Amino acid sequence: PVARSWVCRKTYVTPRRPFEKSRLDQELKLIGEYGLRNKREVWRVKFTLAKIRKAARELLTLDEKDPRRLFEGNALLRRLVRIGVLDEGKMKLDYILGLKIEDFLERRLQTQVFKLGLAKSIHHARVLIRQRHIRVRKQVVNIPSFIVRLDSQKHIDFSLRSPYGGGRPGRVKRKNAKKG
């Protein structure tokens, strides 16, 4: 007996058919459009969307005044609104089946850094986040897949110890300034 937890999950599912041109082109489109690293991140977002859609469908099979349906449907809709995927006016279960992978890919921190103008491209955004240049409300974030909430959207600022921010220059600029 040990005081350790053995609970864990896989966050993705490998596709059942490995080679088909349509899915390969769609996944390549998504990777290039959002600056992703591998097919595994696309599959991870696919898996979250599939889980959400399955929960929404199983709730939709329930009677309209089921207490579980009301409670858990309101919870799921509230979460999907909170992370910025659904609008506050589309809070109905049926609309959940209308969601795409691209919404969840927009709510990532890499996309929000590119769209807010902090980075000149999506790959520049990924590099900026990974190099401890990006903070959320006070908190330096190193994770490009950090899903930004709506209330954290206006507080992405640029890391008070960063060279382009608070002002201590990096290794390269300090080394060059000492040559002459």
């Binding site: 082109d25 390549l28 489109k29 990777i31 290039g32 600056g35 992703l36 690293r37 591998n38 790959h123 990924r126």
Partner: peptide, 20 residues
Amino acid sequence: KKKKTGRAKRRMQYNRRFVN
């Protein structure tokens, strides 16, 4: 010379496939 790896190779693939 060396091949790019990681995100950079997929970016080069996406440029080679969809841009032109």
